[PDB]
């Protein structure tokens, strides 16, 4: 199954506190071998990223994974484009979910 990917910008209160966490969810994918890549302004980013895979689901026999990119507000607002990319076995084109901080 091709992973359903959803990227989420930092919430309002988190930006009030002084941080910014870009969250990414990749649900309903099999096999469990999956690689998640963050792209800030088109360039790969691996620092501040923590990944968490679930065990195979008890109902549809699929996997899920959460990849979270943590940054300071100063680092978050000095860049614009954020991309979450999924390399999986279902396709040679990585599944891309990208958003611009402006919109």
């Amino acid at each position: 199954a091709a992973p359903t990917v959803s990227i989420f910008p930092p919430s309002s209160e988190q930006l009030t506190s002084g941080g910014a966490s870009v969250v990414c969810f990749l649900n309903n994918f099999y096999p469990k071998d999956i690689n998640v890549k963050w792209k800030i302004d088109g360039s790969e980013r691996q620092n501040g990223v923590l990944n968490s895979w679930t065990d195979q689901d008890s109902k549809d026999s699929t996997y899920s994974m959460s990849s979270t990119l943590t940054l300071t507000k100063d680092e978050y607002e000095r860049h614009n484009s954020y991309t979450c990319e999924a390399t999986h076995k279902t396709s040679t084109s990585p599944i891309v979910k990208s958003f611009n901080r402006n919109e």
């Binding site: 469990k32 679930t54 065990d55 195979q56 689901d57 008890s58 109902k59 026999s61």
Partner: protein, 105 residues
């Protein structure tokens, strides 16, 4: 002490297929071996007590072995049958375990 070698370490199964999980004992333990299933974030569950005995409402597709060679049969693997399967011995006091991971293809 008693060592339980379990094979395979991980397995991929099509739903509706027979599977066997091998549990090998370094010493003869008669039938004093017991099979358990543990799912995600959950405590293990007793499947079949002894070499071959039915427990409550566990699926009726388990239980086999004696002596030093034991096998957990599963006749029709279903979607919920994912998880870690363990065998334990109750003969010697060490009370050892093993480990196998049943995944579904």
């Amino acid at each position: 002490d008693i060592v339980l070698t379990q094979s395979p370490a991980t397995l991929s199964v099509t739903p509706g297929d027979d599977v066997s999980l091998s549990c090998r004992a370094s010493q003869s333990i008669s039938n004093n071996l017991h099979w358990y299933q543990q799912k995600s974030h959950e405590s293990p569950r007793l499947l079949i007590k002894y070499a071959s005995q039915s427990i409550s409402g566990i699926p009726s597709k388990f239980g086999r072995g004696s002596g030093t060679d034991f096998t957990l049969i599963i006749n029709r693997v279903e979607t919920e049958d994912f998880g870690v399967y363990f065998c334990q011995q109750s003969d010697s006091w060490p009370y050892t375990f093993g480990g196998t991971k049943l995944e579904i293809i």
